[PDB]
Amino acid sequence: TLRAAVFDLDGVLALPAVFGVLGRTEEALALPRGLLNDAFQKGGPEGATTRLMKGEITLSQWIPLMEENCRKCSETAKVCLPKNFSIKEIFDKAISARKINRPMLQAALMLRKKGFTTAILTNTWLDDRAERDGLAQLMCELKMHFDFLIESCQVGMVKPEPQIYKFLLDTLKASPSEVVFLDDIGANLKPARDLGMVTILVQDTDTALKELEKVTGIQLLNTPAPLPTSCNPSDMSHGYVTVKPRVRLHFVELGSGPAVCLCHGFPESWYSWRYQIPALAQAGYRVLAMDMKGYGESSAPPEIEEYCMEVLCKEMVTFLDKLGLSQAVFIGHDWGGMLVWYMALFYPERVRAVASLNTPFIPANPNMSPLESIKANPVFDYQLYFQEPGVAEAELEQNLSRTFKSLFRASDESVLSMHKVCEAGGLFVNSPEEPSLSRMVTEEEIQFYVQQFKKSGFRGPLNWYRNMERNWKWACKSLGRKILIPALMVTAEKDFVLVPQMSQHMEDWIPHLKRGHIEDCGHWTQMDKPTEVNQILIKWLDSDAR
Amino acid sequence: TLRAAVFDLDGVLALPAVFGVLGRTEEALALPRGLLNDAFQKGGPEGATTRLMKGEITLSQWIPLMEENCRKCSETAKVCLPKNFSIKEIFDKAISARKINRPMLQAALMLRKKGFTTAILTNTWLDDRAERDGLAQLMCELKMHFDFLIESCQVGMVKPEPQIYKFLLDTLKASPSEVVFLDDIGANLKPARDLGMVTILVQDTDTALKELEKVTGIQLLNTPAPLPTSCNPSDMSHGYVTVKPRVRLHFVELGSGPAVCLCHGFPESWYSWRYQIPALAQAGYRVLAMDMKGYGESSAPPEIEEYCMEVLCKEMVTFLDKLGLSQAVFIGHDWGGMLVWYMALFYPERVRAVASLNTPFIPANPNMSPLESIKANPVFDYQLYFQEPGVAEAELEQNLSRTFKSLFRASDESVLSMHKVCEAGGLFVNSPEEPSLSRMVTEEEIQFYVQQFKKSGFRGPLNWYRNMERNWKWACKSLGRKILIPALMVTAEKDFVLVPQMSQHMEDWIPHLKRGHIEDCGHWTQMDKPTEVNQILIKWLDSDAR
Ligand SMILES: O=C([O-])c1cc(C2CCCCC2)ccc1O
Ligand SMILES: O=C([O-])c1cc(C2CCCCC2)ccc1O
């Protein structure tokens, strides 16, 4: 049986192939056929290209040696090289033009999902070009999805030498017949074939993958639309900032650039944004997925007053102040969405841009007590149940697995009531003791929220709802203000509490507000429809927050 | 300076390339990419293909070794070879499908015309397949146009080994930089390049030839329409048959198949058919270009009566009888055209098919003496001048060069009168002593007719015209007959004696007669418009004489 797949970079994982750019430059400049490809391989294992692929010299060092061999080949062919000929400009263009072959990356990912061991085996160089960042950005994005990455310039060997094949085989800890090897170079497959490994000459992606599925007996073509890339909590950078002596806040960091502070709801985690952290970092953002106060690894003080909007927003400001951030894009959901709107109302200097998932901005009524406002709407009866201290904690802290399995469900799958939650005596009263697993989450994803909620419980989480009177008095100070900073409101079609219509009037308060909308999407926006969340957020970030 | 051009066969001189048929068979049978091309090259210099190209085994011996390596590669790739898989059938098809790349052959010919030394350098096999004749027919047709042909299987070496390059260089008697080398195999050019020879990677013919002209500084693309391939009298098979004790006939032989006896006119040679002998042999015919009685190497008896149609046709029959031919296609021109029509009237059993250039069939008038018939038409005054024995001989045998230069001219270039030739006192009376060279002939071609006419003179040639009374009495015996065998009449637009209109009535005598017609064509049909003569004759031969 097969248990390992090997991918070549150029021509297989990334397109177009750099070999083809030599053949393209000969046609553009009308130089004789194969002149550039022959000057590239001059010497064979003794040439400048092999010293480059083996890693003896840098690509900056290599440039003038190729140039010399280009001059040499043109002299022999009895032809002339043009005036503005620059090897650097040709390679700069070819590298920058080269992008990931997405169907190939998805085939790798599908193979690795079925337990296969995956690796990139490439003849590469040590790029010290002033424009090296581009090739580096590319490599990181591919590498992350494979078990190994074998770069010829770091090991000191090259394809087609037999040694690298015995090195990779040793790294894979597998035998030849257990390995599928994909290369666009016919001669680079011959050693792998002579060893007994299954070989695929990659001309077109579709035929290559058709051979790759017939041989694996695993479907790789015509597959359903894949989920965005998620997080393994063990592989993240974990951050901790002390905002006040008794309170510390925890976050997860990924990417470089404009700071994007992610704020989860109830009863959630930094992990709720798991399908958004890799995508948003890939889009050129510094993602900071918070564990809001009362959750995971952030401090959970017992007092109710520690969770009023004024205290929590001062702490988000202190967090910035201590991290050295003058600004942050603030993207919230559910309770974080509320925090995020009040971050914009009270601290616009510190907020670059503001986005909210499901949660709308709705001003305070200086003529109505907030308690009356909750009773007035039947869907908000669960908030009245969360009022008495200890009541919902006892129910939610009873069987954590059951709690998250009963809550984290898609619109149709809903096992919850939410019409006289107070009367019925709880949220899970008519929910099973052993609920089925939702299609939105895995067993492992459920098991992560369980571990997290074992530290502090639901007192802190529920205390965010226990400050309605405090929140109202503070908000009334902002009644004559308008949100005049970039803003994105995202409504979810099947969210039965945070209904799309509840946002209808927001323009009176945020005139330049951008909108988003996800169909057949319930309350758990981020995991229900991650792809759509990603497409909407990246679009608004590039247009409204550079 | 460059003085040698080297052509690879497969992909350069012949298309399509046999390498491509492996890649085509993998797509048709949906076998993995490169499976057949890798099984073909398995072993490298140690494999079955190298032993075949070096010539250690035959291609029949090779077939089951490739089959074994095909089975082996499919096992490693974890795939299955089909039910009706036959390497023999694949190669049989590929060889038979492969034909000459005509623009490449014309580039070779144009280079060799400008004094270049040309040669075919090919990695080939010793073909013992029952269908070997096809590859053999192909090779002969290319080889003939090149100075050398280097077949790897006969020398015992292969491309890319450095030795064959030093062998070819030695055969060419030239140095590296003096040699242009054309190959479709990138690695087969690398040794030739490393040696200092100019290299051309042949992808498409047009770009390959564009490099080949930029480097030679000789025009090869967009050239005018080339002349058909001619004869070098030194390179022909020369034949001699004794018809009667005093008379022997000479001929030139080329090709295999149905016998095609070519009959020249006055004052011509077997050489008049020079542009027809190679073309007609290529078309699958056994060409027999006669030196009719009185010319070149055939016997020239002095008597007039030896040249009457009855004596000459009995001798063409005796020739057949002695050569072992029951039949022959009989193609004549001018006086041979007359002989040819009477060959069909008197000996249809021995004549397969009959074709005439310019000369029409015209029955005898049993009520008018042939002398009166010649006087009756002003264009035939030259025939009256040819009557008195010795008269025209003295004029034509005076300065042979002048005679052939004055006669062998195209329609416009005509320096001859032909209106009262008798009165004026000769054919060349108002023609220069030193006529210019015609565009139809070279100096060397003129010089060949001179050498030939030095042996016997014009007595025998002119004696063909001195039997008008004898010819008439014999022809009157055939007055109630019709020519009911295949027949082709070819008229020439600008022939001022043998006018197209003179043939108008021929259908009364040959009902099923096929016709041909060449525009802006004078009396010297064969050299005036050889290409058109070839196209017409081959067409009629394939349709009417198998
Ligand atoms: O099932 C759902 O889609 C769904 C779930 C909720 C829960 C989130 C806050 C705590 C308890 C209710 C709210 C609205 C919904 O529409
Ligand atoms: O110049 C011509 O094309 C031309 C030449 C001839 C010669 C051939 C037979 C012997 C003498 C005349 C006849 C007709 C022509 O039209």
Q: Choose from A26, A29, A31, A76 for mutation: most chain B CBs within 10 A.
A: A76
The residue whose CB lies within 8 Å of the most ligand 1 atoms, and thus the one to mutate among A334, A408, A411, A416, is A416
Q: Domains (ranges, CATH) in chain A?
A: 1-16+97-217 (3.40.50.1000), 17-96 (1.10.150.240), 236-546 (3.40.50.1820)
B111-to-A541, B206, B433 alpha-carbon distances in Å: 66, 16, 36
Cβ separation B33–A200 shorter than 8 A: yes
Ligand that lies nearest to the alpha carbon of residue B500, given by its number in the listed order: 2
Given resolution (angstroms): 2.3
Residue B496, ligand 2, Cβ within 6 A: yes
Lookup result for tokens 């009457």: B308
The dihedrals phi and psi of A122, each to the nearest 5 degrees, come to: -130, 145
Q: How far apart are CA A195 and CA A175, in angstroms?
A: 10
Q: How far apart are CA B157 and CA B152, in angstroms?
A: 5
Q: How far apart are CA A403 and CA A393, in angstroms?
A: 11
Experiment type? X-ray
Q: Is B465 considered catalytic here?
A: yes
Q: How far apart are CA A343 and CA B338, in angstroms?
A: 114
Sheet of B4-7: strand order equals B148-151, B117-122, B4-7, B179-183, B198-201
Candidates A33, A38, A211; nearest CB to B32:
A211
Query: What 3-state DSSP class applies to B331?
Result: strand
Active-site amino acid positions of A: 334, 465, 523
Lookup result for tokens 């993240």: A236
Q: Are A118 and A48 in contact (CB under 8 A)?
A: no
Closest alpha carbon to B465 in B417, B421, B503, B423:
B421
Sheet of B286-291: strand order equals B237-244, B247-254, B286-291, B259-263, B328-333, B351-357, B487-492, B514-518
- Please state at what angle helix B186-194 crosses helix B162-172, rounded to 10 degrees: 60
Strands, E assignment, A369-441: none
- If one counts every other C-beta atom within 10 angstroms of the C-beta of residue B97, the result is 12
Residue B268, ligand 2, Cβ within 6 A: no
Residue B437, ligand 2, Cβ within 6 A: no
Please list every residue in chain B followed by a chain break, i.e. its C lies more than 2.5 Å from the next written N.
Answer: none
Nearest ligand 1 atom to the CA of A427 is: 11
Q: How far apart are CA B200 and CA B518, in angstroms?
A: 41
Q: Are B334 and B523 in contact (CB under 8 A)?
A: yes
Q: Which letter does DSSP use for residue A156 in this model?
A: T
Residue B440, ligand 2, Cβ within 6 A: no
Q: Choose from A183, A193, A210, A212 for mutation: most chain B CBs within 10 A.
A: A193
Amino acid at A451: Q
Nearest ligand 1 atom to the CA of A414 is: 1
Q: Is B449 considered catalytic here?
A: no
Lookup result for tokens 């209808």: A504
Q: Are A467 and A308 in contact (CB under 8 A)?
A: yes
Closest alpha carbon to B215 in B359, B55, B371, B107:
B107
Handedness of CA A444, A445, A448, A453 (dihedral sign): negative
Cβ separation A77–B199 shorter than 8 A: yes
Q: Are A182 and A7 in contact (CB under 8 A)?
A: yes
Check the annotation: does A271 bind a ligand.
no
Q: Are B503 and B520 in contact (CB under 8 A)?
A: no
Amino acid at A276: Q
CA A96 vs. chain centroid, Å, equals: 22
* Contacts A–B by Cβ distance under 8 A: 64
Query: What 3-state DSSP class applies to A33?
Result: coil
Q: How far apart are CA B307 and CA B309, in angstroms?
A: 6
Q: How far apart are CA B282 and CA B105, in angstroms?
A: 15
Q: How far apart are CA A22 and CA B356, in angstroms?
A: 60
Amino acid at B81: L
Q: How far apart are CA A226 and CA B273, in angstroms?
A: 76
Cβ separation A207–B34 shorter than 8 A: no
The encoded tokens of residue B146 equal 């090149």
Q: Which letter does DSSP use for residue B437 in this model?
A: P
Instruction: Give the pairing type, strands A4-7 and B487-492.
Output: unpaired
- Tell the burial category of A184 from Cβ atoms under 10 Å away from its Cβ (0-12, 13-18, 19+): buried
Query: What 3-state DSSP class applies to A5?
Result: strand
Chain B closest CA to A11's CA: distance in Å?
15
Q: How far apart are CA A368 and CA B458, in angstroms?
A: 137
Lookup result for tokens 């042909």: B149
Lookup result for tokens 């637009």: B493
Alpha helices in A29-155 (DSSP H): 35-40, 48-54, 59-76, 87-97, 102-113, 133-143, 152-155
A453-to-A236, A261, A458, A466, A530 alpha-carbon distances in Å: 19, 22, 7, 19, 23
Pick the catalytic residue from B38, B183, B291, B334: B334
Q: Are B69 and B38 in contact (CB under 8 A)?
A: no
Nearest ligand 1 atom to the CA of A265 is: 9
Nearest CA in chain B to A1: B78
Q: How far apart are CA A430 and CA A41, in angstroms?
A: 73
Q: Please enumerate residues of B whose Cβ is less than 8 A from a Cβ of A.
A: 32-34, 37-38, 73, 76-79, 186, 189-190, 193, 196, 198-203, 207-208, 211, 214-215
Instruction: Give the pairing type, strands B247-254 and B237-244.
Output: antiparallel
Q: How far apart are CA B336 and CA B288, in angstroms?
A: 13
Q: Burial letters for B518-535: b for 16+ Cβ neighbours within 10 Å, e otherwise? A: beebbbbbbbbbbebbbe
CA B471 to centroid of ligand 2, rounded, Å: 22
Pick the catalytic residue from B465, B495, B528, B544: B465
Q: How far apart are CA B75 and CA A81, in angstroms?
A: 48
CA B527 to centroid of ligand 2, rounded, Å: 14
The residue whose CB lies within 8 Å of the most ligand 2 atoms, and thus the one to mutate among B418, B524, B527, is B418
Q: How far apart are CA B256 and CA B276, in angstroms?
A: 15
Q: Spell out which residues of chain A touch residue B203, defining contact as CB-CB under 8 Å.
A: 33
Q: Spell out which residues of chain A touch residue B201, defining contact as CB-CB under 8 Å.
A: 32-34
Q: For residue B261, list its beta bridge partners.
A: B288, B330
Please list every residue in chain A followed by a chain break, i.e. its C lies more than 2.5 Å from the next written N.
Answer: none
Q: Please enumerate, as own/partner, the contacts of B173-178 that have beta carbons within 8 Å and a separation of 24 or more.
A: B173/B117, B174/B3, B174/B4, B174/B117, B177/B2, B178/B1, B178/B2, B178/B3, B178/B4
- If one counts every other C-beta atom within 10 angstroms of the C-beta of residue B16, the result is 15
Residue A300: half-sphere exposure toward Cβ, Cα within 13 Å? 17
Ligand that lies nearest to the alpha carbon of residue B495, given by its number in the listed order: 2
Q: How far apart are CA B221 and CA B213, in angstroms?
A: 8
Q: Which letter does DSSP use for residue B37 in this model?
A: H
Q: Spell out which residues of chain A touch residue B214, defining contact as CB-CB under 8 Å.
A: 79
B209-to-A88, B2, B340, B350 alpha-carbon distances in Å: 31, 15, 46, 49
Q: How far apart are CA A213 and CA A221, in angstroms?
A: 8
Q: Which letter does DSSP use for residue B225 in this model?
A: P
Q: For residue A201, list its beta bridge partners.
A: A183
Q: How far apart are CA A377 and CA A368, in angstroms?
A: 14
Length of chain A: 546
Write out A7-27 in H/E/C secondary structure: ECCECCCEECCHHHHHHHHHH
Q: Whose CA is nearest to atom 9 of ligand 2?
A: B266
Closest alpha carbon to B202 in B97, B95, B101, B117:
B101
Q: Spell out which residues of chain A touch residue B20, defining contact as CB-CB under 8 Å.
A: none
DSSP A313-342: HHHHHHHHHHHT-S-EEEEEETHHHHHHHH
